């Protein structure tokens, strides 16, 4: 019997299924890029989703249902999430470095100018500005959701969290439409390359963060959170603010300054 | 506006989380979350080291800000002394 | 039971054991690749008759030794076994995520093997620079398999870094401050911070290479306005932190080894050692472009990178002199692990000094992309990182296994390895000063004498590696069980016996605050 | 629980030293041999 | 009581040293390795053009 | 201030190891000048300095590709 | 809805020796077997694909 | 070129390379001294039965081990940077020559006056003339005037390469889309050899560089005959 | 006497010249005659015989300083075996030269090297120190 | 920080404590031999007399051994210390390691 | 620094709901208005086969290899120009 | 019959260290002087002596007459 | 460290077998590939 407060986790298969899902997704992308086949990739995506679902399911079982998240355990998870976000910041930093490298020193092939000859940027005052208002608004509504939960208010937590998720979905649909309407593509030299890869990874993170908020929504509907203990909600809010801040840097850098 | 419907930890915490919470209200620390405060450490006033078994490892920071911690098993019975500074420790099983 | 224990582990010791087994197997692969390199160079002319294959062998040699031998052994192996024990913690913060850091590495290695088996392999150098690594000069799947290998190794180490930082910050006894943790624990925390910040930048760069190869982006292709040199910046913004990641846990193990076999309760100058590792880690992020002094950068940038790089010698020197000051006055035990650590101190110092030579960008014009660089970094990697690994392995093998090595055989092993690596790499300084390029399958005739000697050296190290395997076998074959270990009062990882039980510190240590 | 103690905290058996020799030979030998057979493979392809 | 090193150390040192020198000298001189030493003081230069 | 040309002199606008923009700028200047002259009826001889500098500095394939793109209507610089 | 967390706490604390990934009941076992079959079968298929791709073909 | 059993740098052909030799001698003396001091102190720590195992105060001695290395680093950096900026200094060339890397050979363009360009390939070992150097000779050498400051511009038409001539202290990477500049000045006539110095694929080992340094009048007549 | 694996958490005996008085006696259990010896030790030690004094020492300690500090012939085994294995390595190198390496290029033929040496002197390879500096162009021979 | 005489006096006082216990005797000697010195005869005298009060003949012999060991290659120190201790050795019946044959390997 | 408001004293759910409905969502509504007043297609420019655009170094792994993933026939020309 | 004199008993390790760090310093100065003479100054003088009366055209004519050049016969 | 005598002592002859088998496991497969290189290069 232990007399410390930490969590000895039951032996679990999900690390191995997650690792194999990584093998299948990467060998699957290779097969798709070089051998004209989606089969391995679809298997890998499926086992990846199954792995994430059962792993995070088990974390909910360990915490809400079994009580293993003492304050010491929760404090570790706080550090873990902060450090995870820091690694994601540095991942985006590489794409911003690529963008500033190419745009501050435009080469002769571009016309020696930025934006390149033949590139017609989106107007940053139209849908990009709308998208900025949408994510900023969602950072206000998720803060309302957080204070409602701390104050013990179930209905207004659900309302505010639903508004936050709706805004995340609005951003994603607006961005999808912008991608379709854009007159430039990912193959339009380094302008299209930086634009779509950086905003594309950002859009993927909006989808991830929105999914995480949706998980929190259903956990809230099922009464998992207490007014004092709700780290999954806190982690999703931190991640969501990270997604909002990345967007503000993309807007200022690529859409506005880069136009 | 402000209604309820969110459970509290008092209502819904369970398992080890609930044990820690209830012990903290009593001022008790069965899961070793707090650092114990030293006694004078003499043979007459040894540091009392709780244990659920009949030996426990002690780490002795002999002087404030030493970076070296001195580690040893403390066994049930007569008080033992840190091998570096001599300060006394006595096991109190259960 | 076997599957539950070894495939579904949530135990820091068993996962550490998996990492040590994986890294030892990788070390055999990396050693075989190194012997093929030196066989091609061991006489003038061509051995393989296929320099694309030679280039694939060089490239894979580096990736195997760095990502599948050193990092898994130092961080996954010694880190998982020792860090929780050295702070009295019952396991890592995230014991199940820890198992996925391990299990991502066999698939990563499988991808790297796949890269070398399909098409003509990735004959790129471990830098994977475009456009040689792009889809015209390396058409087909090999480079993409290499990129995906790196992605999985990167995720493995980023999650591991999160695990180690969280464990070391959050799971010490409540009375123990960060300045009461052992130096190996510090060395792992600082390595983990470097991994956390640097690997995402590599991931960004190799993802851009993946999309230039497959989605018609042009990050690195001037035809689209891109720039090959941008890739080099992103790569080396990771790659210089990476070499400090490769050595820092070694520094931590050397501190413990020198302290222990000097009969000391503590290393000399503990807070100076912490300062030095932190300073090295910080400066390790602001020097990367000394990998790029011949690409055409402005002179003032070259002057800055020369100067910043040289500053690293100051904290590193404090560590070397503090190791010497730990030996000072010691009751010296001439154990095999002590011999490894003493070899480390001297040979690491030689390699660090040739790094200071190379930091001077004026001289680096003539030394860049020559064997002087190869000589430099095999002194710090083959005689620093590897000697720290061997020292740690011999020192802690009885803790992990419960059995003793034969110390006479271990000393014989050290002696052979020491001769071999020095015969291999010392003459490469002469080859570099006299202009032999690296990444060559054959050389102008003048360079024959030193290439011949270097290749003969490589076979001596092979004999040492074969003997290492026999020495491990003989220990497990003879089953001499450990009894008493001295100095447990300042080496907590030994205090639960050999091997320690599956669960340790179920009851945490008692440490008061006073 | 699990077995604990020397020879029991490893995924391979050390109960018979000759079976162990065979297993370690296959293990380290396969890693060391692999690059030679990859080179052979690439040579034979073209 | 004498151990392995008291009993066999002298023979191991003498035999290992003798064997090592003998086989490396043979390898270095008897099997056609071309060390390509300096021509200085060794090679008589010969007309090439 | 006429002939005696040996090679392109140091140009303080382009003092560093990367001389790409020096080649490009002189190529542009030559062709902008030539366009101005041939139009208004003047003499391209006033453009000769730019011609000598860019011919000295620019790789033949760069000049050739840029010339082909001007002819194709796909040259991305402004002339 | 109604708060049924207490029922779930009783279920997942039942003293039945099951690990947490199977402690929900028979559906956990099915999902686990599906996941592991897809992973191991997919991995064998990846090795088959390696074998195919390791040789020149067309 | 290098010669058998060589230990150090090729003899200097240019003033900058001579500067680099003297700077290397200065730096290697420091390297030898520090490495030898560390080996000696190791041996000193390990050769006494006297002991002192109680805690040792580090404050005083860490001042020596930071300040003295800092001073030594400054004594390396000062001449190091002097040469760096001397290299960069404005030289005013009287000739510009371009070289383009390719897989696997170099082309050269001399277009200050006429359109002169040619390719330069390694002589295969089976076609060497007696006395010629394996892996180092080329069919068409880079003829250049001696005793004159020459601007070399380096680029590539495919992957990265790197244009190096050790005895002149030159190495400039060849990057497609980029035109990198370096300056060359040979104090002597003769033949000066280098080798591609950025891995560029399967024949990286086999695309060397040979400069042929001669009086201006010979260079002019050669240039004219190569049109 | 007998140290047991299950004793790992108890105070233990060690012979270390820097820890002269270990935490436990070497021998804890006493026979009848050893008990009488420990009683006699409470009286004047001048009344103990030399043999009794040695026996008291060997109850308290295992090895003396001279015994624990003795040097050994191990170095001979280590150096000799290392040379044996280095010698074995040259057998591998002999095997490689015989069965793996084919002929080296024709540029290493004696006549080629003599011609190449003259051509290097004709182009004054390394004429300041490295190579042609060692040739006497006036006397047409290598400098002495 | 402290004179030699003051250091020696503290150590004499430490061992002279009449009811010094076995643990304190070992702690004292094991701490003392960490310092860069061979203890003065007057310190060793007090330690040997502590051994006598603790009825521990063997530790008295061991203390003489560790004096010889701390001198390292300075072969003149141990015979000087034994010379200075001869009245105490005679009074207490302490045989030296040499007289017991314990200097033989 | 800031733009000017008030609030505070012990901020909570009521204040953040006030900000959500009183500032954040009205701003989204204004930007939604602004966008749907500037919507409507602009004239696509003349096609010019610039070599730094419409890059094709490897066929795309879908379709006919020559269409980007979110190809819009109205505004995204192929390397050979707009589709009919 | 004679007593032994009291030898130094304290600070023997520190005394050894001081003495040999001083000696290491003296050796290091002795080496720096040797290396300046045997390597650095030697090289400076070899280049200075080589170039003092060096005749580059004569060197070229010797090379040209030996047949080494593509551009000069 | 101290330790118990070997529970299953490995005699000099046993060590010679284990060492020989170990060395052959590394040398024979690589030796076979390198011996046959010419045969592979003729393909
Ligand atoms: C363990 C790995 C490791 C470590 C720790 C280092 C440490 C250093 N390295 Fe090395 N290096 C590599 C592995 C490593 N390196 C690798 C792999 C490459 C090649 C990458 C590739 O291209 O593939 C490389 C390449 C490399 C280059 C690029 C050369 C080129 O490609 O042209 C440079 C340039 O500055 C450099 C410099 C240094 C310096 C200054 C240090 C310093 O940290 C050393 C500091 C140590 C000391 C100085 C010794 C101890 C100090 C004293 C005793 C104090 C007194 C000393 C003085 C006053 C000088 N390294
Ligand atoms: C739509 C609204 C929301 C936006 C985001 C939508 C989904 C993005 C999903 C993931 C994106 C992640 C990788 C980004 C790679 C490029 C996609 C960029 C975003 C995008 O979707 O770009 C589209 C192209 O996608 C393409 O090439 C093909 C894209 C599909 C194949 C991608 C395969 C590459 C996967 C690489 C993953 C590497 C991950 C490494 C992580 C390492 C961590 C250590 C742009 O369409 P277009 O027709 O060119 O122009 C529009 C013209 N009207
Ligand atoms: C095309 C789209 C493809 C999308 C692929 C990815 C898809 C979406 C994944 C979205 C993430 C969902 C995460 C759900 C986590 C649920 C488990 C959880 O939230 O667990 C919480 C702990 O947090 C925890 O582990 C926190 C655990 C960390 C979670 C981190 C999740 C974000 C990272 C996802 C991966 C991003 C990768 C991007 C790479 C480019 C449980 O503790 P509490 O909440 O305090 O409850 C206890 C109380 O009830 C007691 O009273
Ligand atoms: C680890 C992270 C991995 C990232 C996940 C990557 C997932 C990639 C899935 C891509 O799916 C493709 O989408 C195309 C959309 O353009 C389809 O084109 C299809 O539909 C098009 C029209 O809708 C036509 O071009 C063709 O008929 C047809 O190829 C194509 O078939 C389909 O497979
Ligand atoms: C860099 C790592 C390598 C280091 C050096 C390896 C040292 C050599 C070990 C011996 O290897 C064997 O050598 C034999 C020759 O001695 C080969 O037999 C070959 O040659 C024999 C004699 O000609 C024939 O009988 C066999 O059929 C034929 O396979 C055999 O295949 C190979 O296993
Ligand atoms: C059913 C639940 C009442 C709380 C409880 O007793 O379960 C109520 C309270 C808050 C409601 C949600 C929030 O008002 C937010 C959303 C509002 C939309 O108009 C309907 C869906 C929407 C998602 C609501 C669904 C449902 O009526 C909820 C979830
Ligand atoms: Cu061209 Cu290497
Ligand atoms: Cu570096
Ligand atoms: Mg390079
Ligand atoms: Na919260
Ligand atoms: Na070769
Ligand atoms: Zn203490």
């Amino acid at each position: 019997h232990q007399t410390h407060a930490y969590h000895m986790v039951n032996p679990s298969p999900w690390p191995l299924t997650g690792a194999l899902s990584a093998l299948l997704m990467t060998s699957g992308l290779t097969m798709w890029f070089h051998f004209n086949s989606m089969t391995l990739l679809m298997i890998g995506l499926t086992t990846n989703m199954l792995t994430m679902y059962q792993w995070w399911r088990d974390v909910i079982r360990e915490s809400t249902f079994q009580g293993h998240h003492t304050p010491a355990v929760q404090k570790g998870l706080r550090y873990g999430m902060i450090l995870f976000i820091i690694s994601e910041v540095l991942f985006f930093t590489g794409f911003f470095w690529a963008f500033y490298h190419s745009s501050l020193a435009p080469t002769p092939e571009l016309g020696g100018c930025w934006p390149p000859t033949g590139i017609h940027p989106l107007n940053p005052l139209e849908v990009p500005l709308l998208n900025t208002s949408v994510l900023l608004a969602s950072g206000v509504s998720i803060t309302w959701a957080h204070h409602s939960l701390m104050e013990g208010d179930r209905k207004h937590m659900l309302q505010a969290l639903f508004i936050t998720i709706t805004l995340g979905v609005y951003f994603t649909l607006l961005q999808a439409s912008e991608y379709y309407e854009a007159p430039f593509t990912i193959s339009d030299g380094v302008y299209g390359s930086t634009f779509f890869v950086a905003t594309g990874f950002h859009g993927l993170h909006v989808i991830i963060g929105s999914t995480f908020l949706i998980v929190c929504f259903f956990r809230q509907l099922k009464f998992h959170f207490t007014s004092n203990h709700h780290f999954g909600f806190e982690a999703a809010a931190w991640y969501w603010h990270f997604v909002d801040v990345v967007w503000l840097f993309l807007y200022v850098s690529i859409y506005w300054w880069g136009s | 506006a402000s209604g309820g419907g969110v459970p509290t930890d008092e209502e819904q915490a369970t398992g080890l989380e609930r044990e820690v919470m209830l012990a903290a209200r009593k001022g008790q620390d069965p899961y070793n979350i707090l650092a114990p405060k030293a006694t004078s450490g003499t043979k007459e006033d040894p540091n009392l080291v709780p244990s659920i078994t009949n030996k426990r490892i002690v780490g002795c920071i002999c002087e404030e800000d030493n970076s070296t911690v001195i580690w040893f098993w403390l066994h049930k019975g007569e008080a033992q002394r840190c091998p570096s500074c001599g300060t006394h420790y006595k096991l109190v099983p259960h | 039971m076997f599957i539950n224990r070894w495939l579904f582990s949530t135990n820091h010791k068993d996962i550490g054991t998996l990492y040590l087994l994986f890294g030892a197997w990788a070390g055999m692969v990396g050693t075989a690749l190194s012997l093929l390199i030196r066989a091609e160079l061991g006489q003038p002319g061509t051995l393989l008759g296929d320099d694309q294959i030679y280039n694939v062998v060089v490239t894979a040699h580096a990736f195997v030794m760095i990502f599948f031998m050193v990092m898994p052994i130092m961080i996954g192996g010694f880190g998982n076994w020792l860090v929780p024990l050295m702070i009295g913690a019952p396991d890592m913060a995230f014991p199940r995520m820890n198992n996925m850091s391990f299990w991502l590495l066999p698939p990563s290695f499988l991808l790297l093997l796949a890269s070398s088996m399909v098409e003509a392999g990735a004959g790129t150098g471990w830098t994977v620079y475009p456009p040689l690594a792009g889809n015209l000069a390396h058409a087909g799947a090999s480079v993409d398999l290499t990129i995906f290998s790196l992605h999985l190794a990167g995720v493995s180490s980023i999650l591991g870094a999160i695990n180690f930082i969280t464990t070391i910050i959050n799971m010490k006894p409540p009375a123990m401050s960060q300045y009461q943790t052992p130096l190996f624990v510090w060395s792992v925390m600082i390595t983990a911070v470097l991994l956390l910040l640097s690997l995402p930048v590599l991931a960004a760069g190799i993802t851009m290479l993946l999309t230039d190869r497959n989605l018609n982006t042009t990050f690195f292709d001037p035809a689209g306005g891109g720039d090959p040199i941008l890739y080099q910046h992103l790569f080396w913004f990771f790659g210089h932190p990476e070499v400090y990641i490769l050595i820092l846990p070694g520094f931590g193990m050397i501190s413990h080894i020198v302290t222990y076999y000097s009969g000391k309760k503590e290393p000399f100058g503990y807070m100076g050692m912490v300062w030095a590792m932190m300073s090295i880690g910080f400066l390790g992020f602001i020097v990367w472009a000394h990998h790029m002094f011949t690409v055409g950068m402005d002179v003032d940038t070259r002057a800055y990178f020369t100067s910043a790089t040289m500053i690293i010698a100051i904290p590193t020197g404090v560590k070397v002199f503090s190791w010497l000051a730990t030996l000072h006055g010691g009751n010296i035990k001439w154990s095999p692990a002590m011999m490894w650590a003493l070899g480390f101190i001297f040979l690491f110092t030689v390699g660090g000094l040739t790094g200071i030579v190379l930091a001077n960008s004026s001289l680096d014009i003539v030394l860049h992309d020559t064997y002087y660089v190869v000589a430099h970094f095999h002194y710090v990697l083959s005689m620093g990182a590897v000697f720290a690994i061997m020292g740690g392995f011999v020192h802690w093998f009885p803790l992990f296994s419960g059995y003793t090595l034969n110390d006479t055989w271990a000393k014989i092993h050290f002696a052979i390895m020491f001769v071999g690596v020095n015969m291999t790499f010392f003459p490469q300084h002469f080859l570099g000063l006299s202009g032999m390029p690296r990444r060559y399958s054959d050389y102008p005739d003048a360079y024959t004498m030193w290439n011949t000697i270097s290749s003969m050296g490589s076979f001596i190290s092979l004999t040492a590696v074969m003997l290492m395997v026999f020495i491990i076998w003989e220990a497990f074959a003879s089953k001499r069980e450990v009894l008493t270990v001295d100095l447990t009062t300042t080496n907590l990882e030994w205090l639960n016996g050999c091997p320690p039980p599956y669960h340790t510190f179920e009851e945490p240590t008692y440490v008061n605050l006073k | 629980h699990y077995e604990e103690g020397p020879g029991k905290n490893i995924p391979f058996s050390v109960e018979n030293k000759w079976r162990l020799l065979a297993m370690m030979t296959l293990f380290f030998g396969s890693g060391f041999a692999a690059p030679f057979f990859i080179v052979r493979h690439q040579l034979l392809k073209k | 009581a004498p151990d392995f090193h008291d009993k066999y150390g002298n023979a191991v040192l003498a035999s290992g040293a003798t064997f090592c020198v003998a086989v490396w000298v043979y390898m270095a001189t008897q099997i056609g390795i071309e060390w390509n030493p300096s021509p200085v003081g060794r090679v008589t230069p010969k007309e090439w053009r | 201030k006429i002939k005696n040309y040996q090679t392109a002199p140091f140009d303080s606008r382009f003092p560093n190891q990367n001389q790409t923009r020096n080649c490009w700028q002189n190529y542009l200047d030559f062709h902008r000048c030539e366009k101005a002259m041939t139009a208004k009826g003047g003499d391209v001889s006033v453009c000769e300095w730019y011609r000598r500098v860019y011919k000295s500095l620019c790789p033949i394939s760069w000049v050739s590709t840029w010339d082909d793109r001007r002819a194709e209507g796909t040259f991305p610089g402004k002339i | 809805f109604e708060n049924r967390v207490a029922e779930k706490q009783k279920l997942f604390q039942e003293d039945n020796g099951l690990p947490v990934h199977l402690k929900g009941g028979a559906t956990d076992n099915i999902l686990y077997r599906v996941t592991m079959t897809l992973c191991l079968g997919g991995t064998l298929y990846s090795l088959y694909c390696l074998g195919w791709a390791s040789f020149p073909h067309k | 070129m290098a010669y058998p059993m060589q230990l150090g740098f090729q003899d200097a052909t240019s003033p900058i390379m001579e500067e680099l030799l003297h700077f290397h001698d200065h730096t290697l003396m420091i390297v030898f001294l520090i490495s030898s001091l560390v080996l000696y102190i190791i041996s000193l720590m390990l050769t006494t039965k006297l002991t002192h195992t109680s805690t040792m105060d580090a404050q005083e001695v860490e001042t020596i081990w930071t300040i003295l290395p800092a001073i030594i680093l400054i004594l390396i950096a000062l001449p190091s940077l002097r040469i760096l900026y001397m290299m960069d200094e404005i030289n005013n060339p009287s000739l510009t020559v371009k070289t383009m890397g390719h897989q696997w050979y170099w082309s050269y363009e001399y277009t200050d006056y006429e359109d002169l360009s040619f390719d330069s390939y390694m002589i295969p070992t089976s076609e060497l003339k007696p006395g010629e150097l394996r892996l180092l000779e080329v069919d068409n050498r880079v003829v250049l005037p001696m005793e004159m400051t020459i601007r070399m511009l380096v680029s590539s038409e495919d992957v990265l390469h790197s244009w190096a001539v050790p005895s002149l202290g030159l190495k400039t990477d060849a990057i497609p889309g980029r035109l990198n500049q370096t300056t060359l000045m040979s104090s002597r006539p003769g033949l000066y050899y280098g080798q591609c110095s950025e891995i560029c694929g399967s024949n990286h080992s086999f695309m060397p560089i040979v400069l042929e340094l001669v009086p201006l009048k010979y260079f002019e007549k050669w240039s004219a005959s190569m049109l | 006497s007998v140290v047991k694996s299950e004793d790992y958490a108890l105070p233990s005996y060690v012979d270390r010249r820097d820890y002269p008085l270990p935490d436990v006696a070497h021998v804890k259990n006493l026979s009848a005659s050893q008990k009488a010896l420990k009683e006699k030790e409470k009286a004047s030690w001048s009344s103990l015989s030399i043999d009794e004094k040695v026996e008291l020492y060997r109850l308290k300690f295992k090895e003396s300083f001279a015994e624990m500090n003795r040097s050994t012939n191990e170095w001979k085994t280590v150096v000799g075996a290392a040379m044996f294995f280095i010698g074995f390595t040259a057998l591998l190198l002999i095997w490689e030269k015989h069965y793996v390496y084919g002929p080296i290029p024709h540029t290493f033929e004696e006549e080629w090297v003599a011609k190449q040496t003259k051509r290097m002197l004709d182009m004054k390879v390394a004429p300041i120190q490295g190579f042609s500096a060692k040739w006497d162009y006036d006397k047409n021979e290598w400098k002495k | 920080h402290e004179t030699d005489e003051e250091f020696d006096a503290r150590w004499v006082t430490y061992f002279n404590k009449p009811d010094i216990d076995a643990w304190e005797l070992r702690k004292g000697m094991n701490t003392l031999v960490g310092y860069d010195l061979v203890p003065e005869p007057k310190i060793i005298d007090a330690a040997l007399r502590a051994c006598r009060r603790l009825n521990d003949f063997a530790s008295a012999v061991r203390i003489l051994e560790v004096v010889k060991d701390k001198a390292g290659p300075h072969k003149e120190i141990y015979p000087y210390v034994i010379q200075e201790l001869r009245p105490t050795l005679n009074e207490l019946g302490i045989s030296t390691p040499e007289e017991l044959g314990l200097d033989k390997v | 620094a800031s733009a000017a408001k008030g609030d505070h004293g012990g901020t909570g759910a009521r204040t953040w709901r006030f900000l959500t409905f009183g500032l954040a969502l009205p701003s989204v509504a204004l930007c939604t208005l602004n966008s749907w007043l500037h919507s409507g297609h602009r004239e696509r420019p003349a096609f010019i086969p610039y070599h730094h655009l419409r890059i094709r170094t490897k066929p795309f792994s879908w379709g006919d290899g020559n269409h980007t993933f979110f190809h819009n026939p109205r505004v995204n020309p192929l390397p050979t120009g707009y589709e009919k | 019959s004679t007593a032994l004199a009291k030898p130094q008993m304290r600070g023997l390790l520190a005394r050894r260290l001081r003495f040999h760090i001083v000696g290491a310093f003296m050796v290091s100065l002795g080496f720096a002087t040797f290396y300046k003479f045997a390597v650095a100054e030697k090289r400076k003088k070899a280049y200075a002596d080589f170039y003092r009366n060096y005749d580059s055209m004569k060197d070229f004519e010797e090379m040209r007459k030996a047949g080494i050049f593509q551009s000069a016969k | 460290i101290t330790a118990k005598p070997a529970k299953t002592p490995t005699s000099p002859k046993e060590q010679a077998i284990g060492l020989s088998v170990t060395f052959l496991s590394f040398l024979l497969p690589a030796g076979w590939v390198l011996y046959h290189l010419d045969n592979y290069k003729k393909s």
Side-chain angles (χ1 to χ4, degrees), chain H residues 10-14 18 21-22 24-26 28-29 32-33 37 40-41 43-48 50-52 56 138-143 146-147 187-192 212-215 218-219 222, chain L residues 11-14 16-21 23-25 27-29 31-33 35-36 39-45 47-48 50-51 54-61 63-64 67-73:
Chain H
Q10 288 177 41
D11 280 11
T13 309
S14 63
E18 200 191 325
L21 296 179
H22 297 311
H24 179 248
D25 286 342
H26 167 78
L28 177 59
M29 190 191 77
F32 281 143
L33 238 14
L37 175 69
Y40 174 64
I41 293 172
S43 86
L44 179 70
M45 301 302 89
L46 293 173
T47 43
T48 181
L50 296 172
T51 58
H52 181 188
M56 299 179 175
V138 294
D139 57 356
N140 299 318
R141 300 175 184 154
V142 187
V143 178
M146 70 191 198
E147 298 172 321
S187 305
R188 308 200 305 284
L191 298 180
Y192 301 97
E212 170 169 305
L213 271 289
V214 297
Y218 284 87
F219 164 78
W222 170 85
Chain L
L12 299 166
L13 181 77
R16 178 179 180 269
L17 174 67
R18 262 179 47 95
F19 179 83
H20 286 99
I21 292 301
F25 169 80
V27 174
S28 294
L29 273 52
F31 172 81
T33 291
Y35 177 100
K36 253 195 67 280
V39 176
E41 284 292 324
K42 181 178 181 176
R43 174 137 31 231
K44 268 170 280 191
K45 177 167 187 283
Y47 280 81
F50 181 90
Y51 280 112
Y54 173 65
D55 179 341
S56 61
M57 281 303 317
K58 180 178 185 187
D59 195 13
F60 166 72
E61 291 290 315
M63 295 179 178
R64 179 181 63 80
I68 67 161
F69 296 120
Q70 287 187 342
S71 63
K73 253 59 203 76

Side-chain angles (χ1 to χ4, degrees), chain K residues 1-19:
Chain K
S2 177
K5 294 199 153 305
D7 271 318
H8 217 103
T11 88
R14 194 173 182 195
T15 293
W16 285 94
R17 183 178 73 168
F18 196 158
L19 287 166

Side-chain angles (χ1 to χ4, degrees), chain C residues 266 294 296 300 329 360 368-369 440 442-443 445, chain H residues 6 52 55 80 85 134 171 173 178 180 196-198:
Chain C
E266 55 205 23
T294 60
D300 290 342
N360 290 287
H368 176 71
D369 246 292
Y440 268 29
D442 192 11
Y443 38 80
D445 293 358
Chain H
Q6 182 170 337
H52 181 188
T55 292
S80 183
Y85 279 92
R134 196 178 71 85
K171 182 171 297 114
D173 287 2
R178 191 192 186 95
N180 272 335
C196 182
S197 292
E198 178 68 18

